[PDB]
Amino acid sequence: LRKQRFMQFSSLEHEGEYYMTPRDFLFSVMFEQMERKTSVKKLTKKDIEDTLSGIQTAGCGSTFFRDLGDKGLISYTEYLFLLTILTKPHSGFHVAFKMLDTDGNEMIEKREFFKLQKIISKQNTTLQMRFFGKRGQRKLHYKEFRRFMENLQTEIQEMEFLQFSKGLSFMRKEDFAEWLLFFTNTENKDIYWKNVREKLSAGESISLDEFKSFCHFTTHLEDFAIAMQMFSLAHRPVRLAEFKRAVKVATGQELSNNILDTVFKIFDLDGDECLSHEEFLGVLKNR
């Protein structure tokens, strides 16, 4: 029923063709319940020039949505298209491109409408403008498409960093708990709150790189879990350095001990300073 949610956060509709503002989406992925819209504004057909006027100054980097800020053409189809690229690790990236016609955008331009017409059988966008110029112009090959993949992932990731560090460039090790708790959704288990309230010492912080890497690590969650099959069945709880080289070869993204020690310090309720499979992975499969 994602469509019904898409109606909630969206406030721009055209004969039922609800267009999403760039902010609504970013709010649909950051916040969970927001209702202040009270608007059917876009009916005046300013849309056809509204977006194209403002997209001409878009930041191709990690600000492609932090540059427009609630003005842009985002269709419900494209909305879901971001949801699927939300969860793609590096592995699926080439495949997600290869899932499309893979013969260059000459065969992938129509795939956009094909993306649209797919939802129809089931029953001028900002991206298409950035992907195909004005009327199907730009030849957005894989790497160019891949560029748009990672930064937009980083973007939603990055903006999340501020929402917990309250804008400051540093996130208290205690703040980093809620994000994990908001991730694992096992927050009602006070034992972890009991764990963090004493085991964690309110001290230094975590920068964006250490957090953005960790968030990216979870994008590759599965490949890590498989590399932990031999140990999970062995039930031997993992040590820090073991866990580092593990996630190293698992995701390809190194982490900082300043994170995982806390991750250990919060997830090692057994008190052995070693993460068994049911300790970390067990709660991670709550959602």
Place this chain on the structure above:
Amino acid sequence: LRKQRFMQFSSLEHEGEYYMTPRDFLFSVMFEQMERKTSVKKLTKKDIEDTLSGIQTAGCGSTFFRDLGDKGLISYTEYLFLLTILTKPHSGFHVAFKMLDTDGNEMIEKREFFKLQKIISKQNTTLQMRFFGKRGQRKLHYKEFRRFMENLQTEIQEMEFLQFSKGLSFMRKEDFAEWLLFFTNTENKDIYWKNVREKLSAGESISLDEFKSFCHFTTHLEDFAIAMQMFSLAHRPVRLAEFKRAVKVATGQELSNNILDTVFKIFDLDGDECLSHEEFLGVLKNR
């Protein structure tokens, strides 16, 4: 009882000499109730090198607190010293400097301790380090002191901008309502919410300059009110252009009609499109 609040947000104490982290203060002025500290950390006397190590990379501009991020020596005395410079407009700036010995920091160095000893009769800081080098070295004249005044005002102002625009460089005209409502504290009067819900159209946004100017305009609130005495007793409600030139000569800071029209559109409940004294000023004196 501000001291009792200072205890809440602070988490670093030394024989009762509670030192404030740079973030606690910024959280004490942005948030209102926060309790996650659970720490008496600084007892290990790492403080004497903790701050001085990190302050060496401080951004002298509008990031002097967005540069350290919860590591710094902020005394309860200095805490209040920021509270008083929080509310100073440009007028009091020279005076606030002139309230001190005014004979150059040679007579103003001791004023820092004098600031401290003042609270004692009543019953190595980060700033002093930035104000007097290491042991009473730097001669922070007025303009240099004034530099620290405005940016720190801008800083707390700026960080507030993100907290409502949710990090995005643009603040929805609807977001700008709550800030005013959080300012006027007349939010329980649904008529304004009734006003904004229909009169305001969810559309374009407001940048930082238009907001930071407006926030600065309220720093000079009184001088504006006096320039409105002749009109308030006249009871004639003010027009936009009239209001512009008014706040122009009042604060010295021009605004954008995109703000005040909404301010009009939200505060003109009488429906005459003209702000009477009791309309705007009347609710502004609620706090």
